[PDB]
Write a protein that binds this DNA or RNA. Structure first.
Ligand SMILES: [Zn+2]
Lengths: 140, 51, 50, 99, 1113, 148
RNA sequence: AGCGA
């Protein structure tokens, strides 16, 4: 993540669910951003400090250990790790889906990558992944 | 036309000289996974934690 | 067949494959336009940015 | 404007080429040729007229005249700009590209 | 021999001709259009004079086409009538000051009727406030001043054209009947000769199908179309036959998926081509079609819908176009020539004016209102409702407001000088809604079709990426009620040139043949030479005998706009530089003195009094009382009237707008006379600059490549100086922590700078301010934030209060100064209209007197622009033998290659006018002066002169005038017959070895001043999502070091400088502060980190489930 | 053979690398850091979201609705419809306007999904890579300096 | 949205 001018390769790659949930620092599961009245990020929402880092340098959501001397530790009650307020620029989240979902680029962009991998026509694969037709995936 | 954020500049650079003495706690999940969270000397460790 | 590859890589491949059983891949020079030349480069970052 | 001298023979040149233009126009009126052929003939005739006028101007100007001085020095400007300042503008293009 | 304005100075003209028709009201194109929209009695009587039969305003028209509105039941209906205004609710100056929109209410008599039971419910419904055009042809919105620009749009109607097919080399003719709010039909001939008929962009149909659908089944096709060879060919390609057979098949194609029932097919054709409510070629389209096919010779214009006669005539005309028929004598109408139409010929390119645009917007708003009305017209209970409960005016007022604000035709008033104020009006813009944007507005429409002559100037057009898209109306042009551009002409009968002025559109222009004004008229209407220059329909130019001429131009300078018409000797200048000069004549700035030009045109007085910014004596009388503020006129019958001035009012571009009187207390004035000069006006006529002594020699390289040198005399005597007024604003608003307060109890600041502030915040009027000074002491809460220990102990030692209210006072921005003219303060305590959460609004007006400084832009009236290379002292300037220094020195090398010797002729004639002449006609008149007007044989020093643009000073006449140029004070003819003079070098001393051209040239100061351009940044604000430095001089920002600059650097190979410019000057967020620290401490610059846009890119790619990673080896 | 070539392309592409094709279908969708989709308040309380927050919402609401539906026990029609809406929400999140009608916002304006942040002239690959504003800079009109 | 090179 953080290094020096040491550079020899930039490797792109298709990511996997284990990689995503290893990337993330928390699991956002509420469709809220800010409390309308106090104008502070909600807990467990799209902008929660516990998941995405403080908005205030060396400060915590419940004002427990707001000082540099307290760094790297997590405030036990509110749960917001105390650090600099630019980790929000970098820390990511993840959403665990109750149902797997196909990526769009590899389905729709002509030529269809799933179509070529599974030897399926796009016209008939849309009917599958959009719940318009069934698919037999095994035979005895 | 401008804007701001509810943040603290806290111009303090960094200090590795004195770090509020802190141990590290660990709360294993339901599937054999461990996620260490550091806690201070004065920290009151929870019985269980959101890992 | 029909794919376009760099001359140096073509020749190096032929040099490698003359050993371990000799078969030449038949190549012909092409004159390709600059748009396709630029797009068919080796670095993915530049092609994406283009 | 005193230093922008006009070519004295311009009116005579103009009448000489105007007579040819009139003759080509008359031949078109009498049906001897079509519309595009007469247009081409007028274009060539007026090109000849432009060249003659430019030649007369060039041989008319002295060497110390500031305009021909700046031109012949190569400082800036081609002789056509002098020709069009004094003498003849020549042919002017259509919006489509014709003359 | 000008007239009208009694006080217009006696400006002698070189006009050899006499114009019959006076210049029209230059702002009619706005005023008359708006009064047509309203229905003013003046417009009523004018229409009575010129087409009485149907006097109808735009409102009345929209309300009539709306009325009645009926429910699907048809048991009840609603109607409108009698649009009516009240007086405006507040005057012009008050609306401009208090930011109100200058408007007046609308009252419409609504009328609900119930069919089954039978009643009328009539009211007078407040429709909404409506913006009103002022006297100057402009609107006032939110206080700001806005102009609606007339829009050029293709007229609806029937257009014929053919393409060549290189695969078959056959003419393929077609037709496009494109109406307003309708459908697109395309009758055409295929590569195989067949009359393909594409309907609403749907696969071309055999015409026989559509004729059967029309009821003209194959039998009736034979009945009517007999010569139509392709018609019988397609009677074989008909692929079917029968009225209902073709109707069902075609209707299946027309409405696929819906049952192809004959009933719905019939209803579909009716509802799409004959239901006015759903379809309309409006009045303009009906007139165009009925004149192109000659259906109705003179039938009153109505029935804004297509006719079956119309469609069959269209088909017959198109086949005849492929047959190349000479004309079509339509049965029951007149032979019309079978010619294909153009798309830029002004017979097809109409002009929506303010009236048409506002009417269209009102129509759309009423469509929305109507949908709501008919919706609730069923839900609401009957016997209980009324138009008050039915009508909704919210969408109508919203539509009008959304038009006037935030529309690319409701343009900001561009008034930096009175000429620009005039010229932004009368402007024609081909880009707009329902118009061609620059994406589709390619070169094809940017040329000058020969139909523009007398209707649209070919010269004026912005030099930017709009060349041809934006033009200006000609001088004499007038607007056809149907949106076309009529032009005056002098008709000539049997070689006798009458004075009956008939106005012709482009179609009649093409029909007839047009002569020239500058022709030898022999004082009787009779031409002299038989072979006369003339124009033919296709723009051709011929020598017709003097018998077939039926029309002759009203005058020269008919093809030119207003601004361009003011360029003297225009005919000598090239089109490119003349265009530049016209575009820069609108950019002058009002000087403090505003001396009139020596050499001019006729269009300095008329284009001044019609500009609006000059006070005009409404009715004759005498003067009672004058001041610097108001003039009281005593009319000949009892009444007095006070004309209030406008002193030091800020314009829309920060320039002064002073108005100063010119009369004396005892003077008598007559109606229509100039009574007070405006910003750039002098004794009535335009004054866009100053008359300066000019020399044309290259001096010490300073005037190298368009640079200009001025004397220190202009700086000293204040010849070129511009007053500029800037507006700063601040609002004390409400917040979460409390309420913001304007006051004096500011946080830490010495009382030294609080001397200027008044007892209650804002600064005292007149106190000079410098960059960074305070203007409005204003403080806002900051809540509680724990302090750093260092500042805590600083407060402990220096005993300074926390001052929990942080301070964000109004500081005058960097690089600005000047005096404080006025302070306009609002308040909630005064119950003034403030937006929500705002307690107190205050604006302060700063002003400066910018003197002419090197780097500013000056230009002549010939496009000979240039920045100022240097301002020398007055002594080191080439001075004449009389000790008079020249004032500016232009460069020679720019004259010949730019083909604008108009400046040279202007210089010579200006010197002639300055010195004064006397043609000694001792023995008769000299040869050159034979055809000069009287009282030009002599003139006085500093005597004003005018040369109309295309009939002006001849070269022989100029030589003759320069020959005798009577001496200044001693016997010294400083400028010889050639027009040059011996200059002495002011610097070294020796005379120049060759005589040098000198004269008086009129030049203007352009609005591109150095103070408004110079900009710098060491470290300032930053962007939000990306951490780049901001942009714009409004902010600090930096200069975009763009991709080509990157390429330049790479080509040089300066890798380290590239790294610096792209990492630690723009985006390395932790590197910028480190660099600043190192620079202040004197250390070395640190190594760059990683750019911020790159990290952003990485995070988006990882958000896209793309595993991007960096690998060491 | 032509189709075999076209397919063998991607097939051998997957075979050669250590890439499993399981990642083509997705189970955990990542969420971009908030400062890259900020809601910055303007002076006056007029908040300024980044147009990705509404999409992330849509996915969160539909996912939670699916979770509750499966917990509660719902008919096949409702559950499959919900899975379809979840699919559409994810496709809109990744590239709005690709499949079917683009998801509009207020004023019938299409929203700016992640793909739109890179595609076209306004992508990151241009706006901040075709040039940047730079500190320690300035500009001015120029005049001729013959004595220099 | 308008404008300068
Ligand atoms: Zn806490």
């Amino acid at each position: 993540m953080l290094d020096v001018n040491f550079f020899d390769e930039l490797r792109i790659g298709l990511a996997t669910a284990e990689d995503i949930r290893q990337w993330s620092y928390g699991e956002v599961k509420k469709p809220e951003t800010i409390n309308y009245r106090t104008l502070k990020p909600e807990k467990d929402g799209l902008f929660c400090e516990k998941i995405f880092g403080p908005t205030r340098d060396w400060e915590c959501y419940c004002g427990k250990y707001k000082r540099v001397r307290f760094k790297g530790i997590i405030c036990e009650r509110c749960g917001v790790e105390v650090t600099r307020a630019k980790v929000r620029r970098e820390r990511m989240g993840h959403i665990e889906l109750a149902a797997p979902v196909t990526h769009i680029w590899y389905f729709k962009g002509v030529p269809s990558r799933l179509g070529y991998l599974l030897d399926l026509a796009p016209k008939d694969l849309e009917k599958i992944i959009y719940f318009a037709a069934y698919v037999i995936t095994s035979v005895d | 036309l401008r804007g701001s954020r509810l943040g603290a500049v806290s111009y303090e650079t960094d200090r590795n000289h004195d770090l509020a003495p802190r141990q590290i706690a660990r709360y294993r999940t339901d599937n054999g996974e461990e996620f260490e969270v550091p806690f201070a000397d004065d920290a009151e460790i929870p019985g269980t934690w959101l890992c | 067949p029909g794919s376009l590859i760099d001359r140096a890589e073509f020749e190096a491949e032929n040099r490698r494959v003359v050993a371990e059983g000799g078969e030449p891949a038949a190549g012909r020079p092409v004159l390709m336009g600059i748009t396709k030349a630029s797009l068919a480069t080796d670095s993915w970052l530049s092609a994406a940015s283009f | 404007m005193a230093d922008v001298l006009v070519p004295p023979r311009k009116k005579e040149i103009l009448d000489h080429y105007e007579e040819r233009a009139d003759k080509v126009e008359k031949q078109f009126q009498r049906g001897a040729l079509n519309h595009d052929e007469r247009n081409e003939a007028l274009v060539e005739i007026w090109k000849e007229a432009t060249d003659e006028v430019g030649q007369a101007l060039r041989e008319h100007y002295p060497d110390d005249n500031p305009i021909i001085t700046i031109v012949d020095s190569g400082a800036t400007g081609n002789f056509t700009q002098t020709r069009t300042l004094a003498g003849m503008k020549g042919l002017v293009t259509n919006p489509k590209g014709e003359f | 021999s000008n007239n009208s304005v009694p006080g217009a100075p006696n400006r002698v003209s070189f006009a050899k001709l006499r114009e019959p028709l006076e210049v029209p009201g230059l702002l009619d194109v706005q005023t008359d259009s708006f009064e047509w929209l309203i229905g003013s009695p003046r417009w009523r009587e004018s229409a009575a004079e010129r087409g009485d039969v149907n006097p109808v305003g735009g409102l009345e028209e929209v309300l009539y086409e709306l009325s009645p509105i009926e429910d699907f039941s048809g048991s009840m209906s609603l109607s409108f009538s009698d649009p009516r205004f009240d007086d405006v609710k507040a005057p012009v100056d008050e609306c401009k000051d208090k930011d109100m929109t200058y408007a007046a209410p609308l009252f419409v008599t609504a009328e609900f009727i119930n069919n089954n039971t039978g009643e009328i419910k009539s009211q007078t419904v407040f429709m909404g406030d409506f913006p009103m055009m002022t006297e100057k042809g402009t609107f006032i919105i939110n206080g700001t001043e806005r102009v609606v620009v007339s829009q050029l749009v293709r007229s609806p109607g029937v257009y014929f054209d053919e393409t060549i097919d290189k695969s078959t080399d056959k003419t393929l003719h077609s037709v496009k009947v494109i109406p307003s709010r309708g459908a697109w039909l395309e009758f055409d001939v295929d590569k195989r000769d067949t009359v393909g008929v594409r309907i609403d962009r749907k696969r071309r149909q055999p015409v026989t199908v559509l004729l059967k659908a029309l009821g003209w089944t194959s039998e009736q096709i034979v009945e009517r179309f007999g010569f139509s060879e392709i018609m019988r060919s397609t009677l074989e390609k008909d692929n079917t036959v029968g009225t209902d057979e073709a109707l069902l098949d075609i209707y299946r194609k027309l409405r696929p998926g819906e049952p192809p029932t004959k009933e719905s097919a019939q209803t579909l054709l009716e509802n799409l081509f004959f239901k006015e409510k759903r379809y309309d070629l409006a009045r303009v389209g009906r007139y165009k079609v009925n004149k192109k096919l000659g259906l109705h010779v003179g039938e009153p214009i109505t029935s804004s819908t297509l006719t079956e006669e119309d469609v069959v005539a269209t088909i017959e005309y198109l086949v005849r176009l492929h047959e190349g028929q000479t004309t079509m004598t339509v049965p029951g109408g007149v032979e019309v020539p079978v010619e294909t139409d153009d798309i830029d010929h002004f017979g097809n390119r109409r002009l929506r004016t303010v009236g048409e645009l506002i009417q269209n917007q009102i129509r759309v708003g009423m469509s929305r209102m109507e949908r709501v009305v008919r919706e609730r017209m069923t839900t609401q209970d009957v016997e209980a409702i009324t138009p008050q409960t039915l009508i909704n005016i919210r969408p109508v007022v919203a539509a009008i407001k959304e038009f006037f604000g935030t529309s690319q035709l409701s343009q900001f008033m561009d008034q930096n000088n009175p000429l620009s104020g005039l010229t932004h009006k009368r402007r024609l813009s081909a880009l707009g809604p329902g118009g061609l944007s620059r994406e589709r507005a390619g070169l094809e429409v940017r040329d000058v079709h020969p139909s523009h002559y007398g209707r649209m100037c070919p010269i004026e057009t912005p030099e930017g990426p709009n060349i041809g898209l934006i033009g200006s109306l000609s001088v004499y042009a007038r607007v056809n009620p149907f949106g076309f551009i009529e032009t005056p002409y002098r008709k000539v009968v049997d070689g006798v040139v009458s004075d009956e002025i008939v106005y012709l559109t482009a179609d009649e222009e093409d029909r007839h043949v047009v002569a020239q004004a500058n022709s030898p008229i022999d004082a009787d209407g009779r031409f002299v030479e038989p072979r006369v220059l003339v124009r033919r329909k296709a723009g051709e130019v011929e020598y017709v005998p003097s018998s077939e001429v039926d029309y002759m131009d009203v005058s020269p300078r008919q093809m030119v706009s207003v601004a361009t018409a003011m360029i003297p000797f225009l005919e000598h200048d090239d089109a490119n530089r003349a265009l530049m000069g016209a575009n820069m004549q609108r950019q002058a700035v009002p000087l403090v003195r505003s001396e009139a030009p020596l050499v001019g045109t006729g269009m300095e007085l008329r284009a001044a009094i019609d500009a609006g910014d000059v006070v005009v004596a409404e009715e004759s009388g005498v003067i009672e009382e004058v001041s610097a503020d108001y003039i009281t006129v005593m009319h000949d019958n009892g009444t007095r009237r006070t004309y209030r001035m406008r002193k030091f009012a800020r314009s829309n571009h920060g320039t002064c707008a002073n108005q100063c009187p010119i009369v004396d207390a005892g003077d008598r004035v007559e109606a229509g006379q100039v009574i007070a000069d405006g910003p750039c006006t002098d004794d009535g006529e335009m004054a866009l600059g100053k008359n300066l002594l000019v020399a044309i020699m290259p001096w010490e390289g300073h005037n190298y490549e368009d640079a200009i040198i001025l004397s220190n005399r202009l700086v000293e005597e204040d010849v070129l100086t511009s007053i500029h007024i800037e507006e700063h604003e601040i609002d004390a608003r409400d917040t979460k922590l409390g309420a913001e307060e304007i006051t004096r109890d500011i946080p830490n600041i010495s009382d030294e700078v609080l001397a200027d502030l008044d007892e209650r915040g804002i600064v005292r009027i007149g106190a000079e301010v410098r960059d960074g000074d305070i203007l409005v002491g204003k403080v806002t809460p900051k809540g509680e934030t724990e302090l750093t220990p260092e500042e805590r102990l600083l407060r402990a030692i220096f005993g300074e209060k926390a001052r929990e209210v942080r301070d964000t006072s109004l500081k005058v921005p960097h690089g600005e100064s000047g005096k404080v003219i006025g302070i306009r303060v609002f308040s909630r305590e005064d119950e003034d209209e403030l937006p929500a959460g705002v307690n107190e609004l205050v604006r302060v007006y700063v002003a400066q007197k910018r003197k002419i400084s090197d780097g500013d832009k000056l230009a002549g009236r010939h496009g000979n622009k240039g920045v100022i290379g240097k301002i020398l002292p007055v002594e080191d300037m080439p001075f004449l033998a009389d000790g008079t220094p020249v004032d500016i020195i232009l460069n020679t090398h720019g004259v010949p290659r730019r083909m604008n010797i108009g400046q040279i002729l202007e210089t010579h004639l200006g010197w002639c006018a300055h010195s004064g002449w006397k043609v000694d006609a001792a023995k008769g008149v000299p040869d050159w002066a034979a055809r000069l007007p009287d009282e030009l044989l002599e003139a006085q020093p500093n005597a004003i002169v005018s040369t109309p643009v295309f009939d002006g000073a001849q070269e022989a006449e100029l030589q003759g005038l320069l020959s005798c140029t009577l001496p200044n004070r001693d016997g010294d003819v400083l400028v010889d017959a050639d027009g040059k003079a011996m200059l002495f070098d002011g610097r070294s001393g020796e005379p120049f070895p060759y005589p040098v051209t000198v004269g008086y040239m009129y030049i203007m100061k352009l609005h591109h001043l150095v103070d408004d351009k110079i900009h710098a940044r060491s470290t300032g604000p930053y962007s939000m999502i990306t951490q780049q430095p901001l942009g714009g001089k409004a902010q600090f920002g930096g200069q975009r070091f763009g991709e080509m600059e990157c390429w330049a650097m790479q080509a040089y190979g300066a890798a380290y400088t590239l790294q610096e410019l792209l990492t630690i000057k723009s985006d390395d967020t932790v590197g910028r502060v480190k660099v600043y620290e190192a620079i202040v401490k004197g250390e070395n610059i640190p190594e760059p980190g990683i750019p911020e846009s790159f990290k952003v890119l990485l995070k988006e790619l990882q958000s896209l489930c793309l595993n991007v990673e960096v690998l060491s080896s | 053979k032509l189709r075999a070539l076209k397919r063998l392309k991607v097939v051998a592409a997957f075979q050669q690398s250590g890439n499993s094709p399981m990642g083509m279908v997705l189970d955990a969708v990542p969420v971009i850091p908030p400062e890259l989709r900020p809601m910055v308040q303007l002076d006056g309380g007029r908040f300024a979201t980044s147009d990705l927050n509404d999409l992330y919402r849509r996915v969160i609401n539909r996912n939670n609705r699916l979770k509750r539906l499966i917990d509660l026990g719902a008919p096949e029609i409702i559950v499959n419809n919900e899975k379809r809406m979840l699919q559409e929400s994810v496709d809109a999140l990744f590239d709005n306007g690709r499949r079917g009608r683009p998801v509009t916002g207020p004023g019938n304006r299409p929203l700016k999904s992640l793909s739109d942040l890179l595609k076209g002239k306004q992508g990151r690959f241009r706006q901040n890579l075709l040039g940047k504003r730079v500190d320690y800079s300035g500009r001015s009109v120029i005049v001729v300096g013959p004595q220099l």
